[PDB]
């Protein structure tokens, strides 16, 4: 768990060097993008349940997975699916605020593949659900904030696949 | 917000060889959110609540617990 | 003649559509 600042400090410390001009430039880049990160995080905190339910309405609804036999069939499985998608959106917001995806592979992508493979959860359908969540939130917060959200959404989909 | 409770709990279920005076009769501070669950737990144990204080609580307050 | 439009698939059990025709007749 480290943001862009802590990773820059960790690189300069593992070097043992002081903060040179490249580290200063990286921190200036983060300190310019931080206000946009803050406003996108507020806008995403506004519409958590709406983004999640629009992602299910785009991908998972009216398909086979909500029908009998699907892994999203029962009300318990539906509630756990909404819970999993809320987790993905919340941690993508955290990784957007930090500017570093270390929290994603520390706390989402750690044992997620083995959990989903033990439960029988389809990984492709949940990857499509995360992609639709990314599409909806990029329609919500704009072009560049949607892109800096979608880089961590693509990180979650890549670590899941 | 915090309660002060003196309560006596008897072990009706089984005899316990070790000394249990601290387990049977005790007074402790209990947080307000934990107090509903703890009061329910003391109901289910069969122990009787003897004294409730809430000196810490400042009751009647909407804002600030 | 082989029209190229996508093949119709019969609704599976528990489908939302299955209750479409009665929902159209209902209030």
């Amino acid at each position: 768990m480290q943001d862009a600042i802590t990773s820059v400090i960790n690189s300069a410390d593992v070097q043992g060097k002081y903060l040179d001009g490249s580290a200063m430039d990286k921190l200036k880049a983060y300190f310019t993008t931080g206000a946009l990160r803050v406003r996108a995080a507020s806008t995403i905190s506004a519409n958590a349940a709406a983004i999640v339910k629009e992602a299910v309405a785009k991908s998972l609804l009216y398909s086979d997975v909500t029908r009998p036999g699907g892994n999203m069939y029962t009300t318990r499985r539906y509630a756990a699916c909404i819970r999993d998608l809320d987790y993905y959106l919340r941690y993508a917001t955290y990784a957007m605020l930090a500017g570093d995806p270390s929290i994603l592979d520390e706390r989402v992508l750690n044992g997620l593949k083995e959990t989903y493979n033990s439960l029988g959860v389809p990984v492709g359908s949940t990857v499509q659900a995360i992609q639709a969540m990314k599409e909806v939130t990029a329609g919500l917060v704009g072009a560049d904030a949607g892109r800096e959200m979608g880089v961590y959404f693509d990180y979650i989909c890549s670590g899941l696949s | 917000r915090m309660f002060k409770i003196t309560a006596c709990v008897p072990s009706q279920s089984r005899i316990r060889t070790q000394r249990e005076l601290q387990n049977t009769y005790f007074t402790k501070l209990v947080p307000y959110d934990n107090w509903f669950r703890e009061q329910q737990r003391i109901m289910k144990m069969g122990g009787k609540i003897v004294k409730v204080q809430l000196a810490t609580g400042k009751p009647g307050t909407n804002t600030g617990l | 003649v082989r029209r190229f439009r996508t093949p119709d698939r019969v609704p599976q059990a528990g489908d939302p559509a299955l209750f479409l025709n009665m929902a159209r007749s209902a209030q």
Partner: protein, 160 residues
């Protein structure tokens, strides 16, 4: 079911089935014929149950079908009748199994969270199961209506 519940309740207690639980399983085994008759009564007339219950529901709660409600439009009303069909199917499962662990273990655990995420009033769903109960217990004999109304009663109770 009854056998699952008795086996699990003796299973945690590290004991065999007590004889009272055994005559419980025996009485359920004998009453299974009447349970199957109630199940055929509920299964064979599902069209009229769902149709009349949807009619009485939308008569009773017209705002959910008015523009602004959840079940507004053709496909939304079809999905509403589909959800009512799901709950009648779970009622039939609970009638056969002799206990509400099919109904609860399939369609009642996260029902509040699901219908909260869909934007659905759960009281109107309770009214839908109430009208389904009215049509279904209007369709049977007395003890059959009581035994089916027990499970309908459990569904409306687990809503609120």
């Amino acid at each position: 079911s009854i056998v699952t519940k008795s086996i699990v309740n003796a299973d945690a207690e590290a004991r065999y089935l007590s004889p009272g639980e055994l005559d419980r399983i025996k009485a359920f085994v004998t009453s299974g014929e009447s349970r199957l008759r109630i199940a055929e009564t509920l299964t064979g007339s599902r069209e009229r149950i769902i149709k009349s219950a949807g009619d009485a529901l939308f008569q009773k709660r017209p705002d959910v079908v008015s523009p602004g409600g959840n079940a507004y439009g053709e496909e939304m009303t079809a999905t509403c009748l589909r959800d009512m069909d799901y709950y009648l199917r779970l009622i039939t499962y609970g009638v056969v199994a002799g206990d509400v662990t099919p109904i609860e273990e399939i369609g009642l655990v996260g029902v509040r969270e699901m219908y909260k995420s869909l934007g659905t009033p759960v009281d109107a769903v309770a009214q839908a199961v109430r009208e389904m109960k009215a049509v279904a217990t209007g369709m049977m004999s007395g003890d059959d209506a009581a035994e089916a109304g027990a499970y309908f009663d459990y569904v409306i109770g687990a809503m609120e």
